[PDB]
Amino acid sequence: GRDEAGITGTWYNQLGSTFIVTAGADGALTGTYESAVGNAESRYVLTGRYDSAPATDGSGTALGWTVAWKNNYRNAHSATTWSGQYVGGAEARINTQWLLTSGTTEANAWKSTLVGHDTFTKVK
Amino acid sequence: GRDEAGITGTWYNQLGSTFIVTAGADGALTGTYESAVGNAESRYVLTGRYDSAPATDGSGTALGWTVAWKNNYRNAHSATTWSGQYVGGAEARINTQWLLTSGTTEANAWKSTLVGHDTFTKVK
Amino acid sequence: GRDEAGITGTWYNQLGSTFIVTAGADGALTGTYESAVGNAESRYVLTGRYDSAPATDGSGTALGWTVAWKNNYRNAHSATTWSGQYVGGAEARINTQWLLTSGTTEANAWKSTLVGHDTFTKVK
Amino acid sequence: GRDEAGITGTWYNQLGSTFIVTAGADGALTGTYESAVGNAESRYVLTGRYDSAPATDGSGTALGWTVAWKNNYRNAHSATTWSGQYVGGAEARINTQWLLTSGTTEANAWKSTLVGHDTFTKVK
Numbered sequence: 189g190r191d192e193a194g195i196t197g198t199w200y201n202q203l204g205s206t207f208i209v210t211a212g213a214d215g216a217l218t219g220t221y222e223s224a225v226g227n228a229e230s231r232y233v234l235t236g237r238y239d240s241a242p243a244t245d246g247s248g249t250a251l252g253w254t255v256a257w258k259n260n261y262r263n264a265h266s267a268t269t270w271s272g273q274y275v276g277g278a279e280a281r282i283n284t285q286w287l288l289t290s291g292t293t294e295a296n297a298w299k300s301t302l303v304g305h306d307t308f309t310k311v312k
Numbered sequence: 313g314r315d316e317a318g319i320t321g322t323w324y325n326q327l328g329s330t331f332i333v334t335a336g337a338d339g340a341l342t343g344t345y346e347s348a349v350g351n352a353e354s355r356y357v358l359t360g361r362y363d364s365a366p367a368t369d370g371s372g373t374a375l376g377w378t379v380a381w382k383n384n385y386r387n388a389h390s391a392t393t394w395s396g397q398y399v400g401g402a403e404a405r406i407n408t409q410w411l412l413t414s415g416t417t418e419a420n421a422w423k424s425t426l427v428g429h430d431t432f433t434k435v436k
Numbered sequence: 437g438r439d440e441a442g443i444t445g446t447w448y449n450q451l452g453s454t455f456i457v458t459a460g461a462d463g464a465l466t467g468t469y470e471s472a473v474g475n476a477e478s479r480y481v482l483t484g485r486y487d488s489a490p491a492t493d494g495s496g497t498a499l500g501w502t503v504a505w506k507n508n509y510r511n512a513h514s515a516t517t518w519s520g521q522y523v524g525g526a527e528a529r530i531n532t533q534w535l536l537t538s539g540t541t542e543a544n545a546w547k548s549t550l551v552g553h554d555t556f557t558k559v560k
Numbered sequence: 561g562r563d564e565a566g567i568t569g570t571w572y573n574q575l576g577s578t579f580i581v582t583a584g585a586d587g588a589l590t591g592t593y594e595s596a597v598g599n600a601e602s603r604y605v606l607t608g609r610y611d612s613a614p615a616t617d618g619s620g621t622a623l624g625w626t627v628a629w630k631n632n633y634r635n636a637h638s639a640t641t642w643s644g645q646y647v648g649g650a651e652a653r654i655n656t657q658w659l660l661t662s663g664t665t666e667a668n669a670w671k672s673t674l675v676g677h678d679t680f681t682k683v684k
């Protein structure tokens with residue numbers, strides 16, 4: 189409810205990427221993502237989930253979402269998942285860690301997956 | 313197509329958890345997850361994405377999905393994302409890495425996120 | 437050489453932790469770490485390695501180090517490894533990702549490892 | 561003591577890499593690593609730390625180590641850290657997660673770090 193409202197909207201990360209999400213009453217996340225970097229052009233579908241009844245101790249709201257990097261313009265044969273928590277208030281944030289897996293041969297599977305962290309704000 | 317067919321079904325990981333997924337023609341993943349471990353009971357909604365047009369060099373198919381650990385029985389104030397690749401054939405596998413974030417206070421945010429790896433097969 | 441000089445010293449991360457390191461000519465890192473958070477008191481031994489001949493294209497210098505969280509005051513039955521890169525200049529930084537593993541039972545091994553990111557500066 | 565003995569020796573992972581380590585009485589790990597894959601040839605220095613007084617409940621022993629991928633033959637401008645736990649007994653194992661950072665430009669820092677998992681045994 190509070191965080192359905194707080195999460196729904198347009199977010200921006202430190203790279204200049206754009207995350208457009210709707211948080212549903214059932215815990216769904218749906219929207220589009222546009223990366224400022226990488227083998228990417230325009231918007232990509234995203235879907236995910238969030239805790240629709242977080243704790244009321246002042247904890248964050250756990251959430252995550254996935255982008256497969258295929259759309260009408262490109263196919264980067266890869267998928268990113270962001271896992272993190274939403275923190276509400278005047279300077280709301282979504283603080284995330286992500287895993288970006290590329291499809292590989294079996295011989296290259298050891299080097300399939302990048303790891304990083306993205307912080308999203310409502311302003312940038 | 314090939315991997316819509318190959319991905320859709322029931323999968324099992326090394327912990328004894330059960331992953332029930334439908335891969336759509338558009339790149340969607342939908343289903344339910346049941347963990348054998350942790351603060352979890354019964355099935356949880358999952359949603360994700362996969363590369364619906366993978367390479368044909370013998371590479372894996374990149375995919376990912378999210379579970380928020382809230383259902384009618386429990387709320388563990390946390391979300392897991394799995395990022396990985398599907399590898400088809402007689403002993404098909406989905407090889408994943410995952411990030412499990414709990415909602416935390418700001419003071420505890422440094423210890424919000426677990427990391428691990430799960431391998432899913434069609435048999436176990 | 438340049439980065440032996442640049443890396444050797446006292447660093448501080450965003451949590452207020454203190455990283456005291458000597459970079460040797462052979463690629464060694466030695467020193468002590470003091471965490472501002474967690475099950476930790478005072479200084480802990482650290483050892484690691486760095487690229488002692490980085491690229492000269494303006495790339496970072498790859499490095500990593502380990503702390504086992506045992507000293508004369510406490511034993512937290514855990515170890516952290518930081519992996520990252522040093523970036524020199526007026527606002528030098530060491531940008532890292534870390535893995536913090538606790539010793540667990542086999543049944544709890546799935547939840548053994550925390551993941552996070554720390555940015556170190558010469559000032560804070 | 562028990563794990564000084566148990567950890568010291570030659571280990572092998574699922575890729576066919578060779579990890580030669582000495583565990584000291586003070587918690588030090590020293591040795592050499594030879595990767596079966598990647599931009600690597602021959603042995604590389606490793607250093608790390610382990611919990612020299614683990615719990616006696618049947619928990620694992622937390623440890624970690626670093627390799628910078630520079631030696632007399634090659635320089636891959638990168639460093640790997642493994643974080644994990646040693647589990648003793650007839651089929652002893654070291655179960656690890658790793659982070660492999662390459663030195664990058666600032667513009668490429670988002671894609672600096674690979675993540676994976678290696679399981680080491682005394683036999684393979």
Ligand SMILES: CN(C)c1ccc2c3c(cccc13)C(=O)N(CCNC(=O)CCCC[C@@H]1SC[C@@H]3NC(=O)N[C@@H]31)C2=O
Binds near residue numbers: 228
């Ligand atoms: C050879 N070996 C070292 C690699 C070199 C480059 C790459 C990889 C990859 C996977 C595994 C290895 C490598 C990989 O998936 N890739 C990306 C492919 N896929 C893409 O480029 C799609 C855009 C991804 C944008 C990310 S999502 C997290 C972050 N947050 C944002 O807002 N934007 C960024 C590489 O380049």
Ligand SMILES: CN(C)c1ccc2c3c(cccc13)C(=O)N(CCNC(=O)CCCC[C@@H]1SC[C@@H]3NC(=O)N[C@@H]31)C2=O
Binds near residue numbers: 350
């Ligand atoms: C205090 N500090 C060290 C922790 C101790 C325990 C925990 C945490 C967590 C997050 C951060 C820190 C801790 C966290 O999210 N948690 C889990 C809470 N949430 C749950 O238990 C929900 C079930 C999660 C099951 C996982 S999904 C990846 C894997 N694959 C499967 O098939 N099953 C497992 C902890 O316990």
Ligand SMILES: CN(C)c1ccc2c3c(cccc13)C(=O)N(CCNC(=O)CCCC[C@@H]1SC[C@@H]3NC(=O)N[C@@H]31)C2=O
Binds near residue numbers: 423473
């Ligand atoms: C139950 N389940 C969810 C957990 C809950 C709490 C914990 C864990 C752990 C491991 C696995 C699970 C959990 C774990 O290792 N632990 C830490 C134990 N060990 C310690 O507290 C030692 C200090 C570590 C300080 C870190 S190093 C990275 C960062 N950067 C800094 O400068 N300071 C921080 C937990 O609490």
Ligand SMILES: CN(C)c1ccc2c3c(cccc13)C(=O)N(CCNC(=O)CCCC[C@@H]1SC[C@@H]3NC(=O)N[C@@H]31)C2=O
Binds near residue numbers: 575596676
């Ligand atoms: C372009 N983008 C997607 C990448 C593509 C390839 C690479 C990277 C890297 C870092 C970041 C991105 C990429 C990176 O560090 N690299 C490795 C460079 N460095 C090396 O190859 C040194 C050998 C590393 C061997 C590892 S250690 C963990 C594992 N366990 C073993 O026993 N052996 C393996 C890449 O290739």
